[PDB]
């Protein structure tokens, strides 16, 4: 009943509407800092010289953007990977021109989101649950690190991290395809399999459970009222669902164990997104997608184009156009 | 060849700018998220129904009893995220709804692109940028990328057109 | 910026009209209970 122990007990209390926890003690200020700076910058920040060539890119709503085109623009290439906090600028005017808000937002956000993951562990422990929901969230979290930190580290500059904007996101992924060919990289192909298969199995599971709801209601009422929060009995018939799905395909391609089924639901998209985050994190060090450019030639030696060469023509167009005033030398080596 | 299809649609249709695709994206990413978050919640709110460290064996397809605690799952997510599911039927219907709707939305956008009815441009942006050579946004930067995609891939991608683009007309930035 | 002037009323009714619809149905649901 000392001041510290009381404080510890409030921080870890399971009676708080929103759990705080020790990870929350870091998460809350860092997320509030990131959020408040993000909203203000998105609305009112002036143009930012993202590529360090004194060519400022306007990202905020008051400087002529809408919701789709607006962004918080990445920090200047002149800064590269240097730490650029506010107190390192001669003035806020300078900090804004060179892209300081980006660095403030992404570092606070990554910290806050890492703590979000730990906080998912922590509350699970306080409630006597199994611990691994936080491992599912490591897949999205890893993906955010990849585009905001790891890729900028490998390329040498936060100016090549993903913009905090909708069209800026697209710019990022187009230029990534020209410089890396993410599409011909197997870790991206597994990320697609992870999210497509994730959407598929979401629909499957939802439709099979919804297909086998036990009749508990009249046709004049939502069938959802046939389930009461906390009832002990299951609300659908898994044997009927299995009897339907195993005939749709064949018997042994259908689950009859709900625990294996839900583990599979968890595992497939998490693992696919781990791979795609590792794709970005390894193309950060320029180990790029397969290059089959001019791989097929004829008896004489003429090049016989494949669809890979057609991809290469599109990549070339993205390459020669991007950051059109920023290259003085023939190779875009970073 | 599908990879080439994607890139074609970026350069010619600016398909990423299309809100029907955007709704599709939300639906597929949202479905994947739902899939992962539901499987992990169930697996981490299981009831102890057997003594083994392999918790799979303690489920029987004919048991009537729920195998995980909706109540503890609801508390966890309410305190972590603010909101949680409380209705199992709604939860699983929502899992049907999200990706099915997203895919339907994207199909609609592609129908429009059948007619070149694109969401290619913002007119306000183009008027300003035409008049003000210091105005630049991520929207104008991506259209330069599209213009490169089209000019650099059309001759080989559309061989029946007999496009001959001499070097001097290819759009290119400095040095590259 | 030279935006479509009618975008504003378009956006306003797009928000207002379905939102009002829901609120009407919600409030008359509460006053049954």
């Amino acid at each position: 009943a000392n001041l510290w122990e009381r404080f510890c007990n409030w921080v870890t209390s399971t009676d708080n509407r929103l759990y705080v926890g020790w990870f929350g003690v870091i998460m809350i200020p860092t997320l509030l800092a990131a959020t408040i700076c993000f909203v203000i910058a998105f609305i009112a920040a002036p143009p930012v010289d993202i590529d360090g060539i004194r060519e400022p890119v306007s990202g905020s709503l008051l400087y002529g953007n809408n919701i789709i085109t607006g962004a918080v623009v990445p920090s200047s290439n002149a800064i590269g990977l240097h730490f650029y906090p506010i107190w390192e600028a001669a003035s806020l005017d300078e900090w804004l021109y060179n892209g300081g808000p980006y660095q403030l937002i992404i570092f606070h956000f990554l910290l806050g989101a890492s703590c979000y993951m730990g906080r998912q562990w922590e509350l699970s422990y306080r409630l006597g649950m199994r611990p691994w929901i936080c491992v599912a969230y490591s897949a999205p979290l890893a993906s955010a690190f990849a585009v905001f930190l790891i890729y900028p580290i490998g390329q040498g500059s936060f100016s090549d991290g993903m913009p905090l904007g909708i069209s800026g996101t697209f710019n990022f992924m187009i230029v990534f395809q020209a410089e890396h060919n993410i599409l011909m990289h197997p870790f991206h192909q597994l990320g697609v399999a992870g999210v497509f298969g994730g959407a598929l199995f979401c629909a499957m599971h939802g439709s099979l459970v919804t297909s086998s709801l036990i009749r508990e209601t009249t046709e004049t009422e939502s069938a959802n009222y046939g389930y009461k929060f906390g009832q002990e009995e299951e609300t659908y018939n898994i044997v009927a669902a299995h009897g339907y799905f195993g005939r749709l395909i064949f018997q042994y391609a259908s689950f009859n164990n709900s625990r294996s089924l839900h583990f599979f639901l968890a595992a497939w998209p998490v693992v696919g997104v781990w791979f795609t985050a590792l794709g970005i994190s390894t193309m950060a060090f320029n180990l790029n997608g397969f290059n089959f450019n001019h791989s097929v030639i004829d008896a004489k030696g003429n090049v016989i184009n494949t669809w890979a060469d057609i991809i290469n023509r599109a990549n070339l167009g993205m390459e020669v156009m991007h950051e059109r005033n920023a290259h003085n030398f023939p190779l875009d080596l970073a | 060849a599908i990879f080439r299809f994607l890139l074609f649609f970026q350069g010619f249709h600016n398909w990423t700018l299309n809100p029907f695709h955007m709704m599709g994206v939300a639906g597929v990413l949202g479905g994947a998220l739902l899939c992962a978050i539901h499987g992990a919640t169930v697996e981490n709110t299981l009831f102890q129904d057997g003594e083994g460290a392999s918790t799979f064996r303690a489920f029987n397809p004919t048991q009537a009893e729920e195998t995980y605690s909706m109540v503890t799952a609801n508390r966890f997510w309410s305190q972590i995220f603010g909101i949680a599911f409380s209705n199992k039927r709604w939860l699983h219907f929502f899992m049907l709804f999200v990706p099915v709707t997203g895919l339907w939305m994207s199909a609609i956008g592609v129908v429009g692109l059948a007619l070149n009815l694109r969401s290619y441009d913002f007119i306000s942006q183009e008027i300003r940028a035409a008049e003000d050579p210091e105005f630049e946004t991520f929207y104008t930067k991506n259209l330069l990328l599209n213009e490169g995609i089209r000019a650099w891939m059309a001759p080989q991608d559309q061989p029946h057109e007999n496009f001959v683009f001499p070097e001097e007309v290819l759009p290119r930035g400095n040095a590259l | 910026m030279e935006v479509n002037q009618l975008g504003l009323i378009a956006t306003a009714l797009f928000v207002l009209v379905p939102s009002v619809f829901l609120i009407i149905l919600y409030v008359q649901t509460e006053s049954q209970q």
Binding site: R17, L18, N66, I67, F229 | I83 | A12
Partner: peptide, 30 residues
Amino acid sequence: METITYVFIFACIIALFFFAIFFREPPRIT
């Protein structure tokens, strides 16, 4: 006017988050 509209909708969503969390219908056991 467009800026005002974008920010108004965004602020209405934040306000909705607040009611949805603190003024939700309480889940009640059975």
